[PDB]
Design a protein around this ligand. Structure first.
Ligand SMILES: [Cl-]
Ligand SMILES: [Cl-]
Ligand SMILES: [O-]
Ligand SMILES: [Zn+2]
Ligand SMILES: [Zn+2]
Ligand SMILES: [Zn+2]
Length: 230
């Protein structure tokens, strides 16, 4: 059912409808010679769409907009990037050129600028302290603490019980950390426990890369992170 990394040529984007007015978007990218899938989110709000994260690069993000127009046909008016890496902000310039108001926390914008990644235009206030939550149209934005990155946000869709964990949450198929160059390994399990504590009702949990599942993805991620720590 859910699109897998093997089925998506690099440059194409698939959409997966989760609930009324909630989709994930799935793209693939080459990185260090391997191909990785990557997820983002689309949430309807009236006759407009909120986009969560780019599709990992300008070409993919243009394909994303075209797939949204083809399959949904409503305009993306705002976008949120959930941390500063290129699978989250790469494509922000494509969004901006299309008339999308792009958003990220000041921390994400700061880090993207330091790293040389695309910088979302608008700032999300009220998210700088672990445990902070703010409403953003049809979603809630939550800063759980440092994890995969110091700036990573999670997104919750209360109407659909969809928890988008982004890259702080691993799919079950991933049993090793991979790359954690920007991570806070010491804090990551605590940050996951904040997500659990804040969204225990979540039914559909979406990792930054790979297959969705339930809240068991949180304990799974902690297991992997602790094993890597050791
Ligand atoms: Cl704008
Ligand atoms: Cl605006
Ligand atoms: O990432
Ligand atoms: Zn990342
Ligand atoms: Zn604006
Ligand atoms: Zn990622």
């Amino acid at each position: 059912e859910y699109p897998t990394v093997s089925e998506i040529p690099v440059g194409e984007v698939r959409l997966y409808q989760i609930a009324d007015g909630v989709w994930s978007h799935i793209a693939t990218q080459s990185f260090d010679g391997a191909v990785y899938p990557s997820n983002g989110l689309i949430v309807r709000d009236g006759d407009e769409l909120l986009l969560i994260d780019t599709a990992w690069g300008a070409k993919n993000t243009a394909a994303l907009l075209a797939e949204i127009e083809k399959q949904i046909g409503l305009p993306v008016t705002r976008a949120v990037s959930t941390h500063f890496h290129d699978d989250r902000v790469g494509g922000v310039d494509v969004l901006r050129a299309a008339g999308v108001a792009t958003y990220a926390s000041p921390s994400t914008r700061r880090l993207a600028e330091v790293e040389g990644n695309e910088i979302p235009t608008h700032s999300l206030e009220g998210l700088s302290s672990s445990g902070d939550a703010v409403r953003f149209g049809p979603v809630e934005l939550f800063y759980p603490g440092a994890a995969h990155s110091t700036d990573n946000l999670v997104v919750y869709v209360p109407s659909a019980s969809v928890l988008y964990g982004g890259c702080a949450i691993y799919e079950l198929s991933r049993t090793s950390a991979g790359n954690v160059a920007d991570a806070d390994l010491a804090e990551w399990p605590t940050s996951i426990e904040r997500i659990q504590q804040h969204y225990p009702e979540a039914q559909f949990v979406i990792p930054g890369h790979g297959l969705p599942g339930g809240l068991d993805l949180l304990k799974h991620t902690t297991n992997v992170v602790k094993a890597h720590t050791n």
